[model samples]
Target: GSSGSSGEEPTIGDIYNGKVTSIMQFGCFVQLEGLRKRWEGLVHISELRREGRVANVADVVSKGQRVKVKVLSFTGTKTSLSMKDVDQETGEDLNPNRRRNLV
Candidate 1:
């Protein structure tokens, strides 16, 4: 039995509620909610927009903003998240079929 396998790790395609914890030029970090590990994930600037490119991540999200994000990749300890797959107005999944197309 491995205590490390607590199942709190997120998998690709999983959606979760998160808050923008920090912002940077490259990307913003999101602290996922309702997880045992209190893990924070990265949402790259390129993944913040659905229509056009983003000049600033803060223009899309701010610290403490609640957002629904979809998992793009997981490297056991690191998670890559995306907001483009989630609707900006409704905070729900945009198109399940479109998930694979973005990345």
Candidate 2:
């Protein structure tokens, strides 16, 4: 959990590697480690862009594992990560996804 919650989002609008942390019942957490203030946010199980629903995020993503992610939205204090658009091996944002409002 973040020490202080000021709606402080230090994440750059780009591809990043967020390490998985606490895996709870229906959701999971990730650590956006960085030179700037790191962010620890909860990831929704439905955030996946795969062909189907991820019944158990445990089977999809494990703890302490680096996963490619892009800052999707900031709802309240929760995090959004789409593991499909971004390459698993590399932090490459796929072509299908748009960057911000620009094309």
Candidate 3:
């Protein structure tokens, strides 16, 4: 039964708490538990901000760091994460101040 199965799918904007596995110049890798196998995801630099600069992801988060992120988009076997969807200040979906492009 570990092969594959089809049922309810996770929504595109689903919020999930995951641990940082690796930090690259491009983004952070997150590990999330899946139904059968573990899911590896990526949080891109662009999603990390709308302004300022993120030259290196290590400056922001390190391996083993736990952060809440949302599913920005996903392919058949890939899930892209984004901290932008989840409010960093409150960790909820309700933050009026975060509406602006610059936060």
Candidate 4:
């Protein structure tokens, strides 16, 4: 079971620990516990890079995979995160240009 929220939330550039909940052709959903309640965010396929274009979401992230993601955008309802240039374990920037070089 999953949930949603619309309270005081994390702002852009804020990083948070999350868990992969589901994968889809376009992206994967991550369940995160932020300043408010638990909610879900999307990590688009283009953001799942590690040297190549992610053709499969499952190949990059599995269901229940624990990850650290940086909040890219949040509109109180849906949120977006970036896992491409971030170190999943430390939430540090691995390569700022990782996403820019994805070709």
lDDT of 1 by residue, 1-103 (tens): 6557545677676778888989887788888888787778888877787667678887778888888888777776777888888776677777557435443
Ranking by lDDT: 1, 4, 3, 2
Query: Residue 42 in candidate 2 has what lDDT?
Result: 65
Model 2, TM vs. native: 0.67
- lDDT of each residue in 21-51, candidate 4, tens digit only: 9888788898876557666888888888865
Angstrom error of the Cα, residue 27, model 4: value is 1.1
RMSD (CA, Å), each prediction: 3.7, 6.9, 6.4, 7.5
* Reference-based TM-score of each model: 0.77, 0.67, 0.71, 0.74
Once superposed on the true structure, which residue ranges of model 3 sit more than 4 Å away at CA?
Answer: 1-9, 34-37, 94-103
Total backbone collisions for each predicted model: 0, 0, 0, 0
- lDDT of model 2 at position 22: 82
TM value for model 1:
0.77
1-103: candidate 2 lDDT, tens digit per residue: 7587433464445566788888877777878765265667666766655667667878878889888777666555665665666688766777464557532
Best by TM-score: 1
* After superposition, candidate 4 runs with Cα above 4 Å error: 1-7, 94-103
Q: How many angstroms is residue 22 displaced in model 4 relative to the true structure, after the best TM-score fit? A: 0.6
Evaluate residue 20 in candidate 2 and report its C-alpha lDDT on the 0 to 100 scale.
84
- Best lDDT goes to which candidate? 1
